[PDB]
Amino acid sequence: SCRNYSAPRHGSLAYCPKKRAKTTKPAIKSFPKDDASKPVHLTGYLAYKVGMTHVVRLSTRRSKTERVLKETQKEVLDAVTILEVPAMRIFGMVGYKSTVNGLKAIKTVYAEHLDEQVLARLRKRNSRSSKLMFKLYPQKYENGDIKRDYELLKRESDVVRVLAHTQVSKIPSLNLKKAHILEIQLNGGTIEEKIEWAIERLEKEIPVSEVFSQQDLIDVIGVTKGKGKEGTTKRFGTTILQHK
Amino acid sequence: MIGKRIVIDAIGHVAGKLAGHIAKELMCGIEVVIVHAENVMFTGPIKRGVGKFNSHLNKSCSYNPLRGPFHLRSPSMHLMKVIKRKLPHRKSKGQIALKRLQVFDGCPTEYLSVEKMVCPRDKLEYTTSPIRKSYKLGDLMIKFGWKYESVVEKMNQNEEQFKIEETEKQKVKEQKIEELKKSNKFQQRVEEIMVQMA
Amino acid sequence: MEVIKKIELKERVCAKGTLYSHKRSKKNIYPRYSLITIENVKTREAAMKYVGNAVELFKPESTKEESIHGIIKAVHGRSGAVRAKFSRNISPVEMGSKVYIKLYKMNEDEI
Amino acid sequence: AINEYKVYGIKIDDNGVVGDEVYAHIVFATNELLAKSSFNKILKKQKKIKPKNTKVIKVEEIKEDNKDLDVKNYGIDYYYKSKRCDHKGYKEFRGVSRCHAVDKLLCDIGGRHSVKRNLIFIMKVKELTVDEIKKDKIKIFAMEDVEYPAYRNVLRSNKLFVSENEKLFN
Amino acid sequence: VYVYVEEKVQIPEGCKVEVVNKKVTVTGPKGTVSKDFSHIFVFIDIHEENVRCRLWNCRKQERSKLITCSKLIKNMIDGSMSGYFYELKAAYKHFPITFEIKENGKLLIVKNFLGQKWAREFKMIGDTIIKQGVTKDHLILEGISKEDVSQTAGLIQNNCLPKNLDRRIFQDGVYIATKGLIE
Amino acid sequence: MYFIKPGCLIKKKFSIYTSIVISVIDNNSVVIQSYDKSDNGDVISIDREVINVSKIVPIGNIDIKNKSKKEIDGILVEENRNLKNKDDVLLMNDFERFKEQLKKEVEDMVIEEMA
RNA sequence: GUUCUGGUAAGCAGGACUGGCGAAGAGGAAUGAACCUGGCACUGUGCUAAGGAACCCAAUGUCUGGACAGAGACCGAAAGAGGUAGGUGAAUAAAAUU
């Protein structure tokens, strides 16, 4: 038989199955469309959540059809979040090729000198290492392997991305000695221009002012607070049954 | 026979007719590679094809969609599933047979040089009347979310380059040898080697 | 290596065919007889000229016996396939395999 | 294939040759038994002699010559049984024999009206000259004015798979 | 079943025509047009200063397609010796319609239809160009291709009518007044 | 393109020798004079026959505006005089076949050194 | 299966005649107590039935007409127009047409 009265569903099926995220650090998985008509620029960055406060702003927004003569100005109180963004350092690049199975990576190329903070991500336990990690790679600069590598990237690639890490040693409250590593896409110009722009900047520091400015719209990707195992009343919002 | 391989150019064949011939070979031990899956032809208007495909997407497992049917959206994979159900795939003999088959949209670089076979009985211009409509599988599959059309257009342009280069490279050797072999300097040594084999 | 030589010797002198099924109806199988197709033989009239000829299945990876002998008994159907009998029953695992046709006749008792 | 036969027969009672008449019937059929069957059918419907009082004295086949396979025009008068009633009509055909003409009618009505061959009856077969032709269909072919090209392709070889660079059709 | 069907079109003094496969291409004073007949089963060729279509042993509905093919070819030839035109006329009982031509005659804007405050924008298909007529209420379209010209005119007529009003009281519109070849 | 009209020269399905069309019956059948040869001892035979058009391939035209059967037999025996059932390599004895093979095989060894 | 009586009917209730399943396997209708072929001790070689012959799956092709509807091969009524293939009977005709 049909149910007696109509009502909406509890919770959205767009988020089922609701399983736990695998690790706490997110990759940007989707990037805005490239346009060859513009200069070479970066498309993303990493940040740390500090906390919240509130502000008062002035406003003058009203219906275009509102017949009121006076240029009314009004105070509005708003809540805001603060994020800390120290400069990231560039340490390598990756090229990709388009196939019937999507984008696949061709080769990765690293800077001649790498920092202790970034090498620390490559080992599991910080305090127990022989530190023989990248010690043989610098020969590839002498041998011309680097110059052969750039040729292959420049010859056969559709998309180019840089590798950047964050300077965790500047934020002591994190209690963290391993940097976080992110792969960031370059839009604008041609493949050759993109590669030259990257090559000029390995080992250097890019400030956040390169990427974003005031009044801009941005997308924020993150992992939510954890709450453990929970019942249906809190997980999906269903009503509590009769008291007896 | 086990140990024989065959490469098929799929263009201009009617899908359900080629699939029957291919499936018989897989059961006899041949390894088959199909190339150009996006160019196979179906008969009738495209309008009818669209409705048959809509009725297929509607099918799903009621209690758990991750068990239910998987609706494949690539020309290569679609033609693979047409061949799959003309084999005994619920049993080991069919599962062995299936692993001998590969299907590609376009022509990959490892198969440009290899000589290629064709099936005259299944070509559209033999097996159907001229006065009725048809469509390509590549034309139907863009409407249900295939995303690699442009990648295949770029491949198709590399093939044309290779065809013109190889034909130009061949015609010169044909001319060279045929002009050479009329000469006395050639026809002399015929005798010089035969003196030692007669 | 004797196996590599024994193959080349056989390749130079025999016609080639493949094993594809036992004699069967829609429901039942008769594993005493097997069905073969021969390379370029494509009519029943063409196929009749092979009735009586010897056949051999050679299997080098075998630990027991390196080859099985048999004889072609009859034509089967209208497109040039044949029926044959061997000294032992052919396993379902051996379907799809290559068979050699030996260009001389033998008696049903010899196998 | 269809053939032409002529059957002859008399009446008998408890004693022989009870009438001095002999009856004849020309028929198109596949064999002699189908011919004899027709003779019995017509006798019982146009007279009233049932088989037990009949005897067939002769059956003969009728055959033409036409060593050069010359092509001729024929007109045929026929009827057939449908679900409603019996339908009469006339049609014209071309061929190398009366039997060749008759086999083409039987095929035609089966195609156009969904009738098995035993429900069709031939009344008359006549050979005609160019001035006699009534309907539109055959006149252009009779006046010798037709040429056309080939619409159907033809296979070159019996092999199932062939190399891409070979010639495939005709 | 028809035994034989033939249709013929004559190529005028200035014109030149070629046939590659089933694509037929035409050149002449006003420019070039081409059309592909690969979707019809027919045999097309050029013979003694004519374009010739043929079929043998065909059904009733196949010969209709042959004839249709022959009429389209004539329109291509005619359009190449002189182009076609279409004439539009604005009609109103209260609110005067006004027209703007932009982008060298590739864009038309309409304003004030039935007192509506929002504008409407229409784009010219293919070779076509839009021009002002004898009084402010008239527009003229001119082009090589009868298809492209007539399709454009139709789109304007079909959009510029009343909606959800009684059309025999509210008679305002933009109507196709005249059509033909240019002199 | 060729046409099916009296005097067209045709081949039949899976056959090497030419034959000729004599009369046209309807939009799908014709009367032909057909040539064939018994490989058992070179015994030829030519005879008339009714055939459907889906089994024949046109290749050319001749006159025969008016001729008798015996005349057209003459036309046909001249036309296909040059043709054969099989490549001679399969018909000759073993030693002759090997002698013919050597010529080709030696010629390659020359060309591969000379090129 | 062929027929009959009661009932709007029913895989409903109740009779008559000739074979079945009960107490009947085997091959075929994808599957099915009763339908098609056809009645069983135990082996070996040949041949046919019913039903099949692109592929699943042992064996498949040919000729002539129809038919375009995500139709049909599996499938509902009284009532009907449209498209196309043919028959017969009326006209008119300075190609034909109704």
Short mmCIF file of C-alpha atoms (C1' of nucleotides) in Angstrom, two decimals, chain G:
data_model
loop_
_atom_site.label_atom_id
_atom_site.label_comp_id
_atom_site.label_asym_id
_atom_site.label_seq_id
_atom_site.Cartn_x
_atom_site.Cartn_y
_atom_site.Cartn_z
"C1'" G G 1 -8.25 -34.81 -29.04
"C1'" U G 2 -13.50 -34.90 -30.59
"C1'" U G 3 -18.35 -33.68 -28.48
"C1'" C G 4 -22.37 -32.47 -24.57
"C1'" U G 5 -25.11 -30.22 -19.77
"C1'" G G 6 -25.26 -26.25 -15.63
"C1'" G G 7 -22.85 -21.28 -15.17
"C1'" U G 8 -20.92 -14.05 -17.33
"C1'" A G 9 -16.90 -17.10 -16.96
"C1'" A G 10 -12.81 -20.20 -14.51
"C1'" G G 11 -6.04 -24.01 -14.09
"C1'" C G 12 -14.79 -24.32 -12.26
"C1'" A G 13 -18.52 -28.46 -11.35
"C1'" G G 14 -20.51 -32.98 -13.89
"C1'" G G 15 -21.20 -37.29 -18.34
"C1'" A G 16 -19.82 -40.13 -23.39
"C1'" C G 17 -15.91 -42.14 -27.10
"C1'" U G 18 -10.46 -43.45 -28.68
"C1'" G G 19 -5.26 -43.32 -27.09
"C1'" G G 20 -2.00 -41.55 -22.56
"C1'" C G 21 0.49 -40.07 -17.30
"C1'" G G 22 -0.55 -42.97 -12.91
"C1'" A G 23 3.15 -47.55 -13.23
"C1'" A G 24 7.32 -44.76 -18.91
"C1'" G G 25 13.04 -44.00 -19.71
"C1'" A G 26 15.47 -41.89 -24.25
"C1'" G G 27 16.06 -37.59 -28.52
"C1'" G G 28 13.20 -32.81 -29.71
"C1'" A G 29 9.64 -28.19 -28.52
"C1'" A G 30 15.45 -22.82 -24.07
"C1'" U G 31 12.61 -24.64 -19.26
"C1'" G G 32 7.47 -28.05 -18.26
"C1'" A G 33 3.62 -35.39 -15.42
"C1'" A G 34 0.20 -35.61 -19.93
"C1'" C G 35 2.50 -32.14 -26.68
"C1'" C G 36 6.10 -34.16 -31.49
"C1'" U G 37 9.43 -38.63 -32.79
"C1'" G G 38 9.16 -43.15 -30.57
"C1'" G G 39 8.62 -48.09 -25.94
"C1'" C G 40 14.45 -49.44 -22.63
"C1'" A G 41 18.99 -56.70 -21.11
"C1'" C G 42 24.51 -55.82 -22.36
"C1'" U G 43 28.56 -54.32 -26.37
"C1'" G G 44 30.60 -52.72 -31.63
"C1'" U G 45 30.10 -50.54 -36.69
"C1'" G G 46 26.65 -48.11 -40.20
"C1'" C G 47 21.64 -45.17 -41.29
"C1'" U G 48 17.22 -42.23 -40.34
"C1'" A G 49 12.96 -39.62 -37.41
"C1'" A G 50 11.05 -35.23 -34.89
"C1'" G G 51 13.71 -30.96 -34.96
"C1'" G G 52 17.79 -28.17 -36.78
"C1'" A G 53 22.12 -25.94 -40.09
"C1'" A G 54 25.85 -16.93 -38.99
"C1'" C G 55 27.86 -17.45 -33.37
"C1'" C G 56 26.70 -19.71 -28.34
"C1'" C G 57 26.13 -25.42 -30.44
"C1'" A G 58 27.27 -31.04 -34.33
"C1'" A G 59 25.56 -29.34 -39.57
"C1'" U G 60 23.92 -23.69 -44.72
"C1'" G G 61 23.60 -22.16 -48.76
"C1'" U G 62 20.67 -20.63 -53.23
"C1'" C G 63 16.39 -18.31 -56.37
"C1'" U G 64 11.77 -15.24 -56.85
"C1'" G G 65 8.23 -11.63 -54.86
"C1'" G G 66 6.58 -8.51 -50.46
"C1'" A G 67 7.74 -5.40 -45.98
"C1'" C G 68 10.75 0.33 -42.82
"C1'" A G 69 7.48 0.26 -37.71
"C1'" G G 70 13.46 0.85 -31.72
"C1'" A G 71 8.60 -3.61 -36.44
"C1'" G G 72 8.71 -8.87 -36.91
"C1'" A G 73 10.32 -13.72 -36.07
"C1'" C G 74 6.35 -14.35 -29.52
"C1'" C G 75 1.76 -11.32 -29.06
"C1'" G G 76 -6.11 -8.33 -28.27
"C1'" A G 77 -11.57 -6.34 -30.48
"C1'" A G 78 -15.42 -3.18 -33.01
"C1'" A G 79 -14.02 0.58 -35.94
"C1'" G G 80 -10.79 3.03 -39.52
"C1'" A G 81 -7.38 6.63 -42.72
"C1'" G G 82 -2.24 7.01 -44.81
"C1'" G G 83 1.92 4.48 -47.79
"C1'" U G 84 2.98 0.51 -51.22
"C1'" A G 85 2.09 -4.33 -54.36
"C1'" G G 86 -1.60 -6.77 -57.39
"C1'" G G 87 -7.08 -8.32 -59.48
"C1'" U G 88 -11.84 -6.99 -61.59
"C1'" G G 89 -15.51 -3.42 -63.45
"C1'" A G 90 -16.93 1.79 -65.02
"C1'" A G 91 -15.67 6.24 -67.67
"C1'" U G 92 -12.84 10.05 -70.42
"C1'" A G 93 -8.40 10.69 -73.63
"C1'" A G 94 -5.34 15.95 -77.16
"C1'" A G 95 0.76 11.54 -72.32
"C1'" A G 96 -2.69 8.76 -69.97
"C1'" U G 97 -6.18 10.38 -66.12
"C1'" U G 98 -10.46 9.66 -62.68
#
